[PDB]
Structure formats: C-alpha cells, structure tokens
Enzyme design. Structure first.
Site, PDB file in Angstrom:
ATOM      1  N   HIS B 150     -27.212  -9.643  23.913  1.00  0.00           N
ATOM      2  CA  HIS B 150     -27.815  -8.521  23.470  1.00  0.00           C
ATOM      3  C   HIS B 150     -29.167  -8.232  23.702  1.00  0.00           C
ATOM      4  O   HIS B 150     -29.826  -6.934  23.772  1.00  0.00           O
ATOM      5  CB  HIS B 150     -27.515  -7.921  21.820  1.00  0.00           C
ATOM      6  CG  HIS B 150     -26.137  -7.405  21.478  1.00  0.00           C
ATOM      7  ND1 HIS B 150     -25.868  -6.321  21.959  1.00  0.00           N
ATOM      8  CD2 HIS B 150     -25.502  -8.003  20.603  1.00  0.00           C
ATOM      9  CE1 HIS B 150     -24.637  -5.937  21.566  1.00  0.00           C
ATOM     10  NE2 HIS B 150     -24.264  -6.933  20.673  1.00  0.00           N
TER      11      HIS B 150
HETATM   12 ZN   LIG Z   1     -21.570  -9.013  18.676  1.00  0.00          ZN
END
Ligand SMILES: [Zn+2]
Ligand SMILES: [Zn+2]
Ligand SMILES: [Zn+2]
Ligand SMILES: [Zn+2]
Ligand SMILES: [Zn+2]
Lengths: 353, 385, 183, 576
Positions: B150
């Site tokens: 992320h």
């Molecule tokens: Zn995740």
C-alpha cells in the site's frame, strides 16, 4: 506499576469479582532458532553503505481550519501560505507579528490627516497611471484573501453551486447521506450495499409494478426460499431506467460520490481522437438562453447543442433522420470512390507491366 | 467463461519437489502498533511457533536476513521520504508538522517508534529472499513480515510504510526477464500496480473486492498504459465469495496468464484479510480455499516467492500461514494443533481448521462470466512476450 | 453599485476555471505561454493601430500601464485560489534564490488577469473615485473584454492534460494537496 | 451526423439501445458499414518526476513508473470508503484478541530485555573490580535492536525516570544493571500471573460468542421468515415470474416460458415427518379445540394421502411406528355436519372434439385454487424443502460428528464447553436427522429454550442449517392455514370439487373446462386463480398463475389440438 490499561485495571492484576461473575457460569520446540538461523547477506547491493482578545480559529484568508499564525493586535489568524509574503513556518518572524491591516494602522498612527497626505503624495507620484492611483494606494491597506468568484458569475448558471468550502458542485454530486448519520446507527444489518434484499428493490415504489432491466426485460426475483436467483436491480439517477448489475457490468451500488449515469446517455464529452474536444455547452439559464428554430433543417450544422421538438437551436426528428441518412449515403459514395480510385490505379499499373 | 464446479480437497503433488527458505527475524513481533489498530507483527511470532511445533523446521532452512539500508530502500522511495522515516518518532512528531502532512506518516496510520527498525527488517527479509531465489539456493522464500503493497513512492498509506514488495521485485528483476505478481489479498495493492503500471517485465494480477471500498481503485478497465497495456490484470469481485467460486475464477485466469505471459519468477502475496471472520476483509474464504491458490501456483514449478500481507485477526492468519508453509513443504498437516506458547489463542476447537460463515455469495455466474471474458480478451494481446 | 458586463463565454471560462482549480485539483501550468505583459501589449498595439485621436491613445496606454501595475500588485494578494498559493510561494522562494524579484506580469497567464477584471467592480466600489473616471475605466475594460471574447479561441482552449501535454492546466501530486490545501 | 462522434463510438452507444434485438442491430451493422482508459490514474507533468532518489541505478528507471499517479482520495471522489457491518458479537470477539495481543506484547518484550540485562550482568560479574569501574555499555547494549529495551524501561520506569535509568545504565552498568534486572524480573512474574488469571476469562467469554458470531444470517432469518413469508410476497414472487414470462414473450425468439413454480418430491417419508410435527404442534396448541384439533389432523392426513397418492394405511402405520420409537372420506371431513355425525357415531365436430382427448389411466392431475389453498401448499413446499436439505446433509454431518476427537487436555482444565453436553443437546454419534426432528419437537412442545436449540444446530451444522430456526413459527403457520380449509366455505367447496375430480380416473377436456368454470363460479372476479398440476410418475408439482382469460390447461403443441380446444371451449355457453 498501578496504571489502568484497556482491561479496566493495572496489568499485574487479575479480574475483579464483578467481572468474574457477570462473565462466567458459576518442553516446546521453538526453544531452538538461536542455533538454526544463520544470516543471509547474499544480496547484490551489499556494497551500498546506506486587553485579552481571543483569536479566531478560522484562516481569515480562506475560512478553513488548521495551524495559523495570529496577530498580536487583532484576533485574525492566517495560515502560513495565506500571507504576503507566505511566511515559512520553519523561520517565524522574531518578535510580535502584525497583519497588513494593523501594520497600516500603526504606520498611519490612526490619524486620518497623515492618511490623506500620503494618499495625495502617492497619487501625485504615479501620474502615468492616474486612473488606478486610488486603488494602487489601497492595495497595501487590507489583509490578503483567496479569490472567490463574485455571485454574479455563479448565479448566471443555475446548475453550478458553491460547495461547503467554496468548491465546484455541478449538480452531478449525489447528496450527503443525512440519515446515513442515521446509517452509522442503522437498523441491524440490511446495510447500504443492499445484500440479500430485493422485495422493495425489484419493485417500483410509487406505482407498485416491477423495475425491469432495459437489457434483459425481466425483473429476476427468484424466491426468498431460494435466494440465489436475484440480480440486484439499481435505478439510474438521470433517466431512472433500472439495470441489473450484470447488464451494466459494474459490480457495486454507487452510493457515495457521484450520480450514476446509464449507458443510455449520449456523451457529455467526446475526444474525437483525430483529439478534438466537447460538443455540449453549459446550461445558461436565468432565462437568457437563445432558442432559435432554424428555417433550414436538412443541411444545418449549428452545434452539438440540439434540443428536440415534435444559442441552442431546436430541431425535429425528420431533420435528424435526413442528416443521418445524408451522412450514411455520402460516406458510402466516398468509400466507393476510394475503392474505384484504387482499382483504376491498380489496372493502370497492371497494364504498365 | 466462468464455470461453477465443486471443490476437490487439496492434495500434495508427488513429483514437484523443492527446497524452501523461511526468513524470520527474532525481533519482528516486539513492536506493538499504537492502540489495538488492525495490524500487529505479533501475528508473525504466533505463526512461527506452529511452524516450529509441527516439526517443519526439519523440512527447510530457517534464515535471518540482515535489515535493509537506506541505500537499498531508496531503490523505490525518495530520499526526503526515507530521511523523514529514519528520524521520526512519537517524541519528535510536533517538530515535523509539515512533513507529517506531506508524507502522511502521522495520520490514521501513526508511527509507534521502532518504525524504521521494523520497516528495515521487512525490507531486508524480502530482498534477501529475492536474492537467494536469484542465486539458485532455493525455490521458495517465505517471509510473513513483508507484503506492504500500500505504500506509495513518497508517502505511506494504509500502514504499508515501506513497500518492500517493490524492492524485492527489483532484486528479482536484476536477473529474471519476466516477473508475475499474484495478489489474493481482498484489498487492491495499489502501491505495486502504480509502481509497475507502464512496464512489460512485470505483470500484476489482483483479485480484489471492488466498490466503495479501500483503496477505491482497481476497476476492470485499469489495464496499464504505455508499454504496459494489457499487462495489469484486475479481477473486481463482490462480497461473500467462497471456496468453489474463488477456485473457479482463480484457476482459469491464472492458467491463461501462465500459458501466454509465461513468467520465469512468481511473487505471491498471501494476505490474510481475504478470509472469513477477518477484522476488515469482506470475503468468506476458508483456509483450504485460500491454500488452494498457493497449491495451484506451486503446481507450475517455477521460481516462486511467498510474501505476507494483511490479516487483522491473528489466529486465522497464523493458522493459514502455518498450513501454507506446510503445503509448500509437500506435507498436508494434521488438523490437530501441537502444543505451542500461544495454544490458548485458537479456542474453542483448538484445531487447524478455519470455518467459513454462511455469508451470501453475491457473485452471480453471469457477472463472473462477463468479467473473465473481458480479462481473456485483454490477455489475448500478451501472447507475444 | 458599479457593474461590469462580462460576455457569457468568458463567464463560462471563469466557471470552468473554478472547476479545474477546485475539485479536479488542477493548477495553472507556469510560467504560462502567453502572459499578461504580452496580452495587454498586443491588445494596446492592435487598438492603437485603430485609434486616431491622440487623447484616445494616451488613455489606452495609461489604462494598460495601470492594469499591468495592478497585476503586479494584485496577483499575490487577491487573485490566487488556496490550492495554487504554494506554486506562487515556491516561485517566490526561487526568486530569493536567484535575487531576481518576482513580478507576476511576465509569468502568469490571462486567466488570473480575467479574475482581476471579474473582481474589479468591487475594487472600484471601494474607491472614492469620481463617476466619470470610473465609467471611463469600465468602458476601457469592456472594450478589452470584447477583444478577449474575439480571441478566446486563441487563448482559452482546453486540452485535457491527462493525455497529451502542455495544456493550459496541469495536475498536482498528493504532496501538493497535503501541504497547500490542508496545512 | 455532425462528425462530432466517431463511427465505432456510435455503434457502441447504439448497442446499448438495439443490442437487445439481434435483427435490428445486425441490419444496423450491415447498413452503416461498420490517455486514461482506467478512470483512477492521472498524469503528472514531467517536471515533478525529478526527485533525489539516492540509490536508484539504471534499471529502476527503465522498468519502474514515475509518471502516472494514483491515490485513494482521487478515486474516492473526496468522500467515500464505505465499510462492512461486522455484527456486535464479532466486535466482542475482536476486543479479546486485542487484549491478548497487548498482554503478549508486554510479556515477550520484557523477556527479551530481561535476557539482555541477564547476559550483561553475567559478563560484568566475572571481571575484576577495576574493569567494572570503567566498563561502559555502548548504545544498543551489544544488541541488534536499539528501541525495545528503552521502550520497556520507559513503560516500567515512569518515562522521565525511564530516560534517567537508561542513561544511568549506559554510563554506569555495573551498578544499575542488577537492580533494573531484578525490577524487570519482578514485574515480569507479576505480569505473567495476571496474564493467566485473566486468560481464563478470555476463553470463557470466547466460547459463548464464537459460534454466535460466525453465523448471523441466523438473525436475518428470524425476520426474513416473518416478513418474506407473508401472503403478499408469496403471490408477488409468482406474479413476478408471470410478468417476466409475459414481457419476454414479446421477444418471439425467446421460447415459450415454462410454468411459474416447480417443485420436486423424491423422498416421501418427509411427509410423515411433517405430519408428526403438525400432530405435536396441534396437540400442544391451545388455540384450537379438541374436535377441531382432530379435524385438522384428519384433513392434513387425508389431503396428503389423496394429493401425493400415498395410501392412508401407510401413513397411519408410519405415524404409529413414530409414536412407538419415541417412548371416512374427505368430503365428510370438509362438511362439518358430516364430520360431527360420523365422529359421534363411533355437431359432428363437437362430438369429435369431446371424443378425442379423453385421458385413459389418468396419471396427471390438476387442482384449481384460490389464495388460501395456494398459501397452504406454499407452506408445505417450504417445510418439505428445508427438511429435504437437512436430510440430504444428514449423512456427511453424521460422519463428521463421528470424527470429533475432543482434546482431553482442554476438557480436564474445563476449557471446552460442556454446557450443551450438560443439557444433552450435544449431537451424539448417532443419526443426526432424527436428532434434529426430536429437538424440533421438544422446542415445539416447550421442552427446550429457543437459544439452546439454535446453538445446538449451530455447533452441529456449523453454518449450513440455520433455516430451521423458525421450524416452530412455520409449522404454526401451516396448521393455521389448514384451519382455513375447515372454515372457509368457498375454499371448502373448492376442495370438494378437487376431491370429486381426483377420485375420477378418467376425464375429457370438457370435464376440465366445466371444472375450472365451476371453481371460478365460487370466487369473484377480483380474486386470482392458481392451477397446481401434479405428475404422479415424476412426483413433480407445477404451480401456474392463471390469467383471467388464459386457458384452463397448458397451451397444446399441435394446431389440431388447438382447434379441438377452441371448438370444445366454444361449444359451452361460457365465453371462450
Ligand atoms: Zn489489505
Ligand atoms: Zn488558509
Ligand atoms: Zn493585525
Ligand atoms: Zn439482467
Ligand atoms: Zn441512466
């Protein structure tokens, strides 16, 4: 060590009797590891070394909240980019910082006589720009601010409204979910995304009939003793023609940001790709729009700003019929003539051999 | 192209043999997150214990990768970002009131302390795993500490402060021509996809939930631009997907990818939030429904790495990673758990099995048929590598 | 209350700017290709080629000089959205780096000058100027606006900066929103 | 047509209009002669793709990607990111694991710093006093982790005093290490004792909420069987299939849609089990009187025997054997007076149209029904389908329950839930389906609370058998609707006509027409009509919605049968 944690009491303490009453009814092999792990430094990059007036809590230049430097003589506060010059927060001005308003006031010592004297001198100096002398003087007299369009440009177009912070909101913004504050409370778990419910979802509400899908022509309701035959009908926001999430390949209920627009709206932008741009203007209401029904209907060009009837120019179905068939036949003749030029060049080069 | 079929239990392939390598730093778990927020390295200690108590350490080699330096970290990130990360701490946060906003490192995903240390540990684990895979030392590298997809280039979102997946992928790409990243985490790994959007040496395949759901990215039309067109494969699903549905979607798409793209190295992200009962993930997979994907990828027999990821309920992810390391050693583990320091985590059945819920599978066969048809049409263009 | 009559197409341009520099999170690419110096110079030149009376040309050049000076004295103070200021500030800092002072007239495009014109009614309403001078300035700016409405296809074209290049606008990064918008 | 829209773009935009019609759109295809494609990524100007990036070599510029940006604030439209529901029991199951994570964190951190302090004291002890005088510890104490020991000390030593002891230990280890090690040892022992004495309660509160939070469709089934089982939705599903069939019939290439509802009944014994359930309920029920109770039982038995072609003696013997292992015509039933008396007593074209089509050896039977008979048959089919699901899972469920190797190490520490084994609700390794039936009966009579039955079915049928949670409320419903067939005079006479037709072994088309007309004479025009077509060979049932001007029987396949049907319906004085 005696300080309470998430559990309710100190960490070195078992449960109280109240909790255990209201919560009750009445060699290993990873000893190793420091013996089997051996370091890996096989990587390629191992060469790399490696009076008490309270200040306002809104930035008086853009009316938003944050961290702001205040003035010592006026309660106005300003963000660090909303200053002239924008003061870097790493190097704050040492001493008492004053806004432009207070700086002007203290420089004039609140005497209007010195004000009119300096104004007269200033307008005398720049005689070449005598039209702007008054305002060129008045520019250094007031605090900065951000640029908000005047109301007489926001009120010319009706489909354009200023958001809560001064943001473009072009009527294609869905709505805030007011009873989605009621949603955080909710009922139980029949939540926004509508899982396992189509009694009042495959059924038109006001009429009472069925919300059919334009692409399959059947509201698939299955049965609620066999609920694996539902298909999640959703109604568009513009046309209101409802589709299945399997006919419009999207898999979600658009609920938060925009309004969903069916594949039954034409464009609102094109990118002709050879990459020329829009043909649909704004909606200039306040009742100042020019509707002009032309006296020539079969070879007009006029816009992509059509309005259909039985400068926005009205038009009728037969005119579009004729323009479309004109396009088709002209294009057919064009393609035919292209193929014919190709064939004549070909036969000429052929007999050349 | 979707075809609903029953789920045959997982079986060990007889001839597919390989030595693996399990990277574990004895300190990974020591650093708690601020206050019960979803991630915690703790779920890497627990898993480890099971892998030790099952006697799996005799089936493989357990290594400790020396932590990554700033010089190796910067192979993806920017210096200012790395320097800020290196010096921040809960004490000196107010000193960086601008940076914490520019880099988004002090917001909802805040910095505990050991932050730089834990990030360096994960990065070094992933990079040494990729390197040992490159040097022909092993065929599988297992690191449940990495898997932070992320994190962006100059900012961290959604807890992945250091995007060690990309560092390891670059380390792999220092030898290998083509790398295939297979994300079976419920979320979209926007970090990796964004970081390889315009390249044809890296093909990402992300089986993620789409909708008004973090990170809000990853439509079916996100297919990569420039030279990377047809080299990003997003599979957007809905809630409640189950073992047979997920298998019937995963097997053909992955077989087609491996048949036309033909990667030489695989990076499989085995995040645990795609399981039933997880704190955030809204799927309903079972432990065997998850390990079937790893079994199918392993069936191909090419250099392969297994990385960790999400997983916000420690018990299910620990049991899942234990079963995954077991299956990767060609051994179907007994479902009775041996005694470990964290026995009392896995009540009340104290068994290896994870149990799916009766959540309603919302993925109708027509939708998945259309999705897999679109995806096969896209993959038609990746026949020529 | 002084009033100015902007053409409708320039109002549409200002509203589309409101769109772009707001929640599409764009900014104006700088230094723009056609600044306010060049625009006002070309306007003054073309109109002087038509003006016969000497007093008319004197008033033209006077208003043009005044408008250039108001650009220099106003772009920083009242013509920038909250999202853009960092850019301006950055350029300001770069000035202090090279010891070349910042005068916006040579850097910023026609759109900020059009914003200034849009605000100019209120500015002149904050005056003590005499009626005839105010009306003269209003008429001069309206003639300029008609010139601009003729040239709004050379100046204000849109290009969708996400796909080709060099548009009238460019996108911002996440750090830019972080620092400028939400400090 | 104004050359603003590309040609292929036009074909695509028109497909969404005429793609539902293959002929129109293929003729359109023949007649007309026929960057961000991902909506989440932007492009940044190539003047902010220049950042220091200290150690990037030549490869990570050729392969990586710096131009196109993406962020979860652009793709969320500045407002969004909706989340799942995660019912409250799962939140109470998450708090517990968070508590465990915290305690385990502190325990393992204290141990990891205790070992360092221990080795430091051991190394400083065997030195000489002069070496102890100047012995210093560098930052990190010779360890690879620099922060864990500082964190634990600042946790136990009042963070300000924590820093004091940290620098005092860095400068003066020989005097500070032993005392701080003893303090950490005391704190660790206290923390471990508190950990276990709390860890009992963690398991205690996990057991009672674990299964109750892995199945909570079983709380969207106490309200999805009391709201979606009403008569409104019951007729709405079939009218919806009717509307779909009509609006797809407009598409001539769509084949003739089948009957509305289809049910299949392969296993007959489930009828006996449903009759047992009804028997127990009406026996317990105090809402109906004893004579009306016997009327209900007799009507149920006789209707089942007659419709499903089951011999009455077989149902009686099955109910009798069921009653062991736990320790008069239908017309006389429909007529209350008969019941009470018996219970106290103890052209040429039309000629051919009517001659052809007389079915010999009737195997397919029909029934015409108002709302009430349809709702009753719906209740019956719902109950039979749920019980058939359970009886199809029974074998695997028994084999699974037979392999439950209970960990005795947890049983002796009372770690395993004996509460459901205390009440005997635990599924012993015997047959499961019969235990389901017995437990449902016990619930019906009031022998067992609802929650314990639910949790028993949840622990034995982990997530698959929630449907039976309302096996009481549905039964009470079915019996209640049976009470309609005893009190509704019009529906009673409709049932009488049904019996008259069912006892007949031969019929012609005109017989079916006079049947439908005599039944429709009993109802008004405002009421609907349903036809239940039963096939004795396949035991299939096909329920059809009746359009008020639709035919009595299914549309024939042959135009000769069509003409015969037309003429025989025209021969009667009723409008064709
Ligand atoms: Zn995740
Ligand atoms: Zn501000
Ligand atoms: Zn002030
Ligand atoms: Zn559909
Ligand atoms: Zn629509």
């Amino acid at each position: 060590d005696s300080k309470v944690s998430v559990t309710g009491l100190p960490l070195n303490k078992g449960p109280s009797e109240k909790i255990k009453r209201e919560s009750l009814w009445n060699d290993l092999k990873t000893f190793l590891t420091e013996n089997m792990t051996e370091e890996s430094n096989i990587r390629s990059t191992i060469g790399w070394n490696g009076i008490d007036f309270e200040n306002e809590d809104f930035c008086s230049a853009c009316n938003q909240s944050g961290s702001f430097l205040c003035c010592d003589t006026c309660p106005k506060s300003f963000h660090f980019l909303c200053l002239d010059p924008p003061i870097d927060p790493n190097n704050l001005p040492k001493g008492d910082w004053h806004c432009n308003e207070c700086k002007f006031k203290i420089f004039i010592n609140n005497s209007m006589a010195t004000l009119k004297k300096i104004e007269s001198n200033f307008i005398k100096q720049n005689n070449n720009v005598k039209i702007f002398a008054k305002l060129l003087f008045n520019i250094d007299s007031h605090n900065p601010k951000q640029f908000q369009l005047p109301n007489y440009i926001k009120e010319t177009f009706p489909a354009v409204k200023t958001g809560s912070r001064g943001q473009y909101s072009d009527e294609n913004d869905k709505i805030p979910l007011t009873d989605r504050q009621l949603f955080n409370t909710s009922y139980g778990q029949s939540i926004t995304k509508l899982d396992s419910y189509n009694p009042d979802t495959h059924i038109d509400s006001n009429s009472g009939k069925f919300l059919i899908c334009y692409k399959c022509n059947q509201t698939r309701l299955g049965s609620w003793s066999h609920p694996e035959n539902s298909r999640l009908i959703m109604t568009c926001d513009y046309c209101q023609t409802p589709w299945h999430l399997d006919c419009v390949p999207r898999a979600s209920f658009k609920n938060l940001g925009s309004k969903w627009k069916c594949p039954l709206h034409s464009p609102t932008k094109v990118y002709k790709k050879i990459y020329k741009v829009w043909k649909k203007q704004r909606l200039i209401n306040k009742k100042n729009q020019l509707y002009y029904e032309p006296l020539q209907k079969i070879g007009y060009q006029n816009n992509g700003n059509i309005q259909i009837i039985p400068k926005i120019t009205q038009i009728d179905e037969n005119s579009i019929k004729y323009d479309f068939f004109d396009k088709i036949y002209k294009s057919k003749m064009v393609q035919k003539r292209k193929l014919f030029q190709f064939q004549e060049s070909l036969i000429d080069k052929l007999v050349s051999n | 192209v979707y075809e609903a079929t029953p789920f045959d239990p997982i079986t060990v392939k007889p001839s597919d043999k390989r030595r693996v390598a399990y990277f574990y730093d004895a300190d990974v778990g020591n650093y708690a997150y601020g206050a019960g927020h979803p991630m915690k390295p703790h779920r890497i200690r627990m898993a480890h214990s099971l892998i030790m108590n099952y006697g799996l350490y005799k089936k493989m080699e357990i290594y400790r990768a020396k932590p990554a330096t700033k010089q190796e970290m910067c192979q993806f990130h920017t210096d200012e970002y790395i320097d800020f990360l290196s010096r921040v701490t809960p004490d000196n946060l107010e000193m960086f009131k601008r940076e914490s906003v520019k880099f988004n490192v002090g917001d909802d995903c805040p910095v505990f302390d050991g932050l730089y240390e834990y990030c360096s540990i994960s990065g070094g684990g992933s990079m040494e795993g990729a390197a040992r895979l490159n040097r022909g030392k092993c065929d599988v590298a297992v690191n449940y500490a990495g898997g932070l997809h992320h994190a962006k280039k100059s900012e961290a979102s959604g807890f992945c402060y250091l995007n060690d997946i990309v560092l390891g992928i670059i380390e792999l790409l220092r030898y290998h021509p083509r790398v295939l990243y297979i994300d079976i985490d419920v979320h979209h790994g926007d970090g990796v996809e964004e970081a390889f959007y315009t390249t044809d040496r890296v093909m990402t395949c992300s089986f993620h939930k789409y909708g008004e759901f973090f990170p809000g990215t990853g439509e079916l039309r996100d297919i990569g631009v420039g030279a990377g067109k047809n080299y990003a494969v997003n599979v957007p699903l809905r809630d409640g997907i189950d073992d047979a549905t997920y298998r019937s979607v995963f097997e053909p798409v992955i077989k087609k990818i491996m048949e036309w793209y033909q990667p030489s190295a695989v990076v499989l992200q085995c995040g645990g939030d795609s399981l039933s009962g997880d704190r955030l993930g809204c799927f309903n997979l079972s432990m065997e429904g998850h390990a079937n994907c790893v079994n199918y990828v392993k069936s191909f027999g090419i250099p392969m790495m297994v990385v960790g990821g999400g997983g916000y309920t420690m018990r299910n992810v620990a049991r899942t990673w234990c079963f995954e390391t077991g299956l990767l050693n060609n051994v179907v583990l007994d479902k009775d758990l041996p005694y470990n320091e964290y026995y009392e985590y896995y009540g009340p059945d104290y068994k290896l099995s994870v149990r799916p819920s009766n959540m309603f599978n919302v993925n109708t066969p027509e939708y998945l048929d259309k999705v897999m048809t679109n995806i096969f049409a896209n993959l038609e263009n990746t026949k020529y590598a | 209350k002084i009033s100015l009559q902007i053409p409708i197409k320039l109002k549409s341009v200002l509203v589309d700017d409101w769109e772009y520099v707001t929640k599409d999170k764009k900014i104006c690419r700088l230094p723009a290709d056609v600044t306010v110096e060049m625009v006002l110079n070309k306007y003054e030149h073309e109109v002087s080629q038509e003006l016969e009376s000497p007093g008319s040309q004197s008033q033209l050049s006077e208003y043009c000089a005044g408008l250039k000076l108001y650009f220099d004295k106003c772009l920083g103070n009242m013509l920038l959205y909250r999202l853009e200021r960092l850019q301006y500030d950055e350029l300001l800092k770069k000035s202090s780096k090279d010891q070349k002072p910042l005068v916006p007239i040579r850097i910023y495009g026609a759109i900020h000058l059009l914003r200034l014109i849009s605000v100019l009614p209120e500015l002149i309403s904050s005056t003590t100027m005499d009626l005839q001078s105010c009306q003269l300035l209003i008429k001069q700016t309206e003639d300029f606006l008609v010139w601009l409405l003729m040239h709004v296809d050379e100046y204000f074209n849109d290009k969708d900066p996400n796909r080709s290049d060099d548009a009238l606008y460019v996108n911002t990064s996440s750090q830019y929103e972080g620092v400028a918008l939400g400090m | 047509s104004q050359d603003i829209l590309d040609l292929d773009d036009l074909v695509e935009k028109v497909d969404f209009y005429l793609g539902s019609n293959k002929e129109l759109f293929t003729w359109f295809k023949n007649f007309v002669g026929y960057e961000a494609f991902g909506p989440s990524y932007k492009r940044l100007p190539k003047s902010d793709t220049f950042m220091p990036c200290s150690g990037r070599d030549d490869m990570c510029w050729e392969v990586l990607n710096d131009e196109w940006v993406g962020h979860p604030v652009w793709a969320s439209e500045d407002s969004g990111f909706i989340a799942h529901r995660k019912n409250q029991y799962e939140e109470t199951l998450f708090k517990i694991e968070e508590e465990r994570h915290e305690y385990d964190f502190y325990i393992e951190s204290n141990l990891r710093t205790i070992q360092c302090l221990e080795t430091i004291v051991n190394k400083i002890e065997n030195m000489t006093e002069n070496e102890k005088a100047n012995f210093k510890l560098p930052p990190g104490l010779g360890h690879t982790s620099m922060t864990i020991y500082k964190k634990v000390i600042r946790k136990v030593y009042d963070k300000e005093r924590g820093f004091e002891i940290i620098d005092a230990l860095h400068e003066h280890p020989a005097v500070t290490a032993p005392v701080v090690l003893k303090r950490l040892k005391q704190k660790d022992e206290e923390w471990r004792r508190a950990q276990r004495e709390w860890n009992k309660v963690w398991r205690e509160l996990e057991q009672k909420v674990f299964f109750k939070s892995l199945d909570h469709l079983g709380l969207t089934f106490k309200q999805a069987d009391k709201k979606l089982l009403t008569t409104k939705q019951l007729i709405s599903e079939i009218s919806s299939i009717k509307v779909d069939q009509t609006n797809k019939k407009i598409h001539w290439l769509t084949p003739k849609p089948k009957s509305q509802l289809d049910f299949d009944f392969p296993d007959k014994n489930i009828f006996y089990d449903i009759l047992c359930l009804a028997d127990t309920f009406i026996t317990h029920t105090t809402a109906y009187s004893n004579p009306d109770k016997e009327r209900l039982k007799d009507l149920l038995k006789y209707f089942i025997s007659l419709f499903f072609s089951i011999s009455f003696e077989k149902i009686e013997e099955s109910l009798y054997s069921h009653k062991q292992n736990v320790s008069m015509s239908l017309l006389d039933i429909l007529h209350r007076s008969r019941y009470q008396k018996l219970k106290r007593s103890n052209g040429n074209l039309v000629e051919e149209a009517n001659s052809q089509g007389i079915i010999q050896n009737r195997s397919i039977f029909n029934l015409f029904a108002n709302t009430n008979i349809y709702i009753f048959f719906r209740h019956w089919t719902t109950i039979y389908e749920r019980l058939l699901e359970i009886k199809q899972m029974n074998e695997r469920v028994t084999k699974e329950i037979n392999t439950r190797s209970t960990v005795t190490f947890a049983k002796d520490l009372d770690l395993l839930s004996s509460q459901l084994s205390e009440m005997g609700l635990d599924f012993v390794g015997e047959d499961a389906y019969k235990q389901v039936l017995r437990l449902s009966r016990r619930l019906i009579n009031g022998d067992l609370e609802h929650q314990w039955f639910e949790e028993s079915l949840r622990q034995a049928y982990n997530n698959k058998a929630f449907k039976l949670y309302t096996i009481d409320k549905v039964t009470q419903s079915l019996v209640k609707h049976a009470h309609t067939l005893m009190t509704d005079a019009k529906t009673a006479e409709i049932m009488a006509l049904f019996v008259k037709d069912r006892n007949a072994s031969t019929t012609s088309a005109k017989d079916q027409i006079i049947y439908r007309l005599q039944v429709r004479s009993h109802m008004s025009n405002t009421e609907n009509m349903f036809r239940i077509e039963f096939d004795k060979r396949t035991l299939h049932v096909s329920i059809q919605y009746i359009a008020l001007d639709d035919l009595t029987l299914k549309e024939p396949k042959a135009d000769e049968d069509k003409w015969k049907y037309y003429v025989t319906s025209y021969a009667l004085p009723h409008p064709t």
